[PDB]
Amino acid sequence: SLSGTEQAEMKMAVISEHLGLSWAELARELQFSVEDINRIRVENPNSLLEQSVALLNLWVIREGQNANMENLYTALQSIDRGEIVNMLE
């Protein structure tokens, strides 16, 4: 399969566990609206993990068939979290 889609589940599970405070910046980098980002905050107020999982789930839905993990990697590197990419690739 494409290097940009294989094992998406495990990769996103790991990314979500490691994002921590970085998920909101990632969301902005991925072009999500301030409304969507705050909705995630209010729906999952006590867990950075839940907020991160929610964001990646929203991304999977938005991208649909055009989803490409390389876009997540580029965004991660742009927000200084390239160490997550190194761990995965």
From Swiss-Prot:
Source domain of life: Eukaryota
Maturation and modification: Regulated by phosphorylation. Palmitoylated.
Residues of the full protein shown: 1396 to 1484 of 1881
Tissue expression from the record: Isoform Mu17, isoform Mu18, isoform Mu19 and isoform Mu20 are expressed in skeletal muscle. Isoform Br21 is expressed in brain.
Residues recorded as bearing Phosphothreonine in the entry: T5
Residue ranges constituting the Death domain according to the UniProt record: 8-89
Protein name per its UniProtKB record: Ankyrin-1
Residues with the Phosphoserine modification: S1, S33
Task of the protein: Component of the ankyrin-1 complex, a multiprotein complex involved in the stability and shape of the erythrocyte membrane. Attaches integral membrane proteins to cytoskeletal elements; binds to the erythrocyte membrane protein band 4.2, to Na-K ATPase, to the lymphocyte membrane protein GP85, and to the cytoskeletal proteins fodrin, tubulin, vimentin and desmin. Erythrocyte ankyrins also link spectrin (beta chain) to the cytoplasmic domain of the erythrocytes anion exchange protein; they retain most or all of these binding functions.
Domain notes: The 55 kDa regulatory domain is involved in regulating binding of SPTB/spectrin (beta chain) and SLC4A1/erythrocyte membrane protein band 3. The ANK repeat region forms a spiral around a large central cavity and is involved in binding of ion transporters. Adopts a T-shaped arrangement, in the ankyrin-1 complex, in which ANK 1-5 repeats are orthogonal to ANK 6-24 repeats, with the peptide binding groove of ANK 1-5 repeats oriented toward the membrane. The rearrangement of the ANK 1-5 repeats orients the canonical protein binding groove to directly face the membrane, to interact the membrane-embedded targets RHCE and AQP1.
Quaternary organization: Component of the ankyrin-1 complex in the erythrocyte, composed of ANK1, RHCE, RHAG, SLC4A1, EPB42, GYPA, GYPB and AQP1. Interacts with a number of integral membrane proteins and cytoskeletal proteins. Interacts (via N-terminus) with SPTB/spectrin (beta chain). Also interacts with TTN/titin. Isoform Mu17 interacts with OBSCN isoform 3/obscurin. Interacts with HIF1AN. Interacts (via ANK 1-5 repeats) with RHCE; this interaction mediates the primary membrane attachment site for ANK1. Interacts (via ANK 1-2 repeats) with AQP1 (via the N-terminal). Interacts (via ANK 1-13 repeats) with EPB42.
